[PDB]
Design a protein around this ligand. Structure first.
Ligand SMILES: [Ca+2]
Ligand SMILES: [Ca+2]
Lengths: 219, 219, 219, 219
């Protein structure tokens, strides 16, 4: 029966049947957004949902026999497994993000369809070359996030009161969003020199960020 | 009579005469902005407008005899047809955007002058090589737009209440405009971890965007 | 006496002397900012200012005899002429910007110190290859600016009431600064569909600017 | 005894020992953020802190005997000396930013681990090649900062009242953060033409920045 199913799994029909379901389950998840729609045809799509969930575990079960060990070494497959596992956790108990994390199965459209995998792979591949920089920034953020918590956190605890808060605020300054009117002109009503902290921070952080892009335009 | 008019239409005078009307109609449209101007010379320029509107259909009528099927397979010609057709719809009924969409005819200065044609063509040509990324993103947006509506839409209906509202708001985050103080800090007053949704959303979307630019700096 | 002064002008001493005054007059202009300073050494500097202005007309007079027609064909030289000229208009009458436009003479440090000429020249040279695009956009701005004035100017005359007001606002959206919370969300309270005008606008305008940058990174 | 210690300092175990203390002291500083932690184990940490500071002085002393002049001509060594020195100034007196500047010792993780050095060095190296542009800009800022102070400082002293105040405000505009709704629309309620100062300012500074990025994207 092995080759019987190895022929079912590898079939164009099977793979296109899966893809057909993703675009259907995606269309159905956009409709579950409408509180109106849910009042009318709610039970339909709650069932239609659970149906697809079964179908998908059946496939992943079928797909595992055909591949065994090879499957739990395939990034795209590992994903598909974990993205379905989330969708099996009872619609209750634990955390309720789990109900919401269910929309992640629509990322199977990236998995099930090539060109997409290509494009995703193309993107992902750029990451190892960046880890040296990324390592650098996180060190850098960490260092300033500490200075900031202990330099500004007493008077301005919303923004800098906690290590985590500083991270967030520094990040915000890094995206350069409302950094002056929002954070530093305020800080300067109390700490006139706060500009001496944040302008150098902005330069260094924006510089590094430019360099990193130039690097991705050389690989 | 064909070759007679084929020599009228294909003439330098013809082409340059059309260009003369565009730069003239365009000037007349900047003046129709002023309520002052309209109180004095409004009659002049409404009629001048209708005149130019005739002339342009006449030309398009002429241009179609000279080209027949060659024309409805010309992108630039198709445009001029549609844009003039808009300008034909009676200054009444339906939607006032049809009155406003009339200004689209000034895009004929792009259509009727090469170099422009080249430049526009240069730009457009870059697009097909972005469609893999663009497709990828819209899936990504759609997934997160869905996540957002069910995570934040009950307490925050202005911003995430409807799928469409999530889209707009997610877009707003992508352009990084007032993303934190405008959206995520508020959100965090009620949902402390919302940074876990938006910091990742930001990284991915800005990453993809950098890559997309790097792609264009190859081709 | 001609070659005598051609030996005065072309001298190393002459140029470095001009340069030395620039750095001095520049330092002196940052000091004229201080209302404190002016209350003490103010006359010292007002006269110092009037002195250097003479020295500069003398130079421009000298440089003209030594170069005659070749001079009024030199960008850098024309500049110092027009810049020094501005600084000759009495400290009175007409407009009061002219007194303020005086500090433009510090741009002579660019004109008079090589390598600066290089860098400026390096920079300026790029503009020709952007002219086709820059043209394209101004047509584009102009068309949308007209559309906006007649679509939003009645309810929102601060932002869109006038052709020029619209220019400014569209410019502001293009730098993507406070475009949503500041302009488009407000607009949507009256015109639900304004997002149909501003999202495509942003895309086009951002796209074009990416292409223009990619273009520069080839030439 | 020299070669005895030269073999200690140059030992892999030594360096790895140093790197160990850095990652350890860095963990300690993250914990010194918690007002909680300090009440519990504050003493443990302030002592562990002074211990590490000792060890590092011992090291730098050792390191200097083994390198002498070679050391004080080494960027990375000079750094480590100057960073450890800051941490030596007693917990008392002068400026208390000195207590805060202590956390700068976590930059030793950049100094002591290569690849980081590589990456930092890669970054730093681009700077000499940017100095022509950087000099040009600062003169530019200086010229406009002076103009701005005398054009807007009377009615708007928060933003332009002082040379330094103008620098900051112009800097804020350059990062394009809230430049319109926050600054120029205000300015225009009093000075209708201020757009004539800031739009040209914005173009130039943004132009220069695109060139500087492209310049790097070759070198
Ligand atoms: Ca912003
Ligand atoms: Ca803002």
């Amino acid at each position: 029966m092995y080759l019987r199913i190895t022929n079912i799994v590898e079939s164009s029909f099977f793979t296109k049947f899966i893809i057909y379901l993703i675009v259907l389950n995606g269309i159905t998840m956009g409709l579950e957004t409408s509180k109106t729609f849910m009042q009318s045809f709610g039970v339909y799509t709650t069932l239609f949902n659970q149906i697809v969930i079964t179908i998908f575990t059946i496939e992943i079960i079928l797909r595992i026999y055909v591949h065994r060990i090879s499957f739990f070494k395939d990034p795209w497959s590992l994903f598909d497994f974990f993205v379905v596992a989330i969708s099996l956790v009872p619609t209750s108990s634990g955390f309720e993000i789990l109900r919401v994390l269910r929309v992640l199965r629509l990322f199977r459209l990236v998995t099930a369809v090539p060109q997409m995998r290509k494009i995703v792979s193309a993107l992902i591949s750029v990451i190892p070359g960046m880890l040296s920089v990324i390592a650098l920034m996180t060190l850098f953020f960490y260092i300033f996030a500490i200075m900031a918590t202990q330099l500004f956190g007493e008077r301005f605890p919303e923004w800098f009161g906690t290590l985590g808060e500083s991270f967030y605020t520094l990040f915000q300054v890094m995206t350069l969003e409302s950094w002056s009117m929002g954070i530093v002109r305020p800080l300067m009503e109390v700490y006139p020199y706060a500009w001496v902290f944040f302008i150098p921070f902005i330069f260094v952080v924006t510089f590094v960020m430019i360099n990193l892009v130039v690097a991705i335009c050389v690989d």
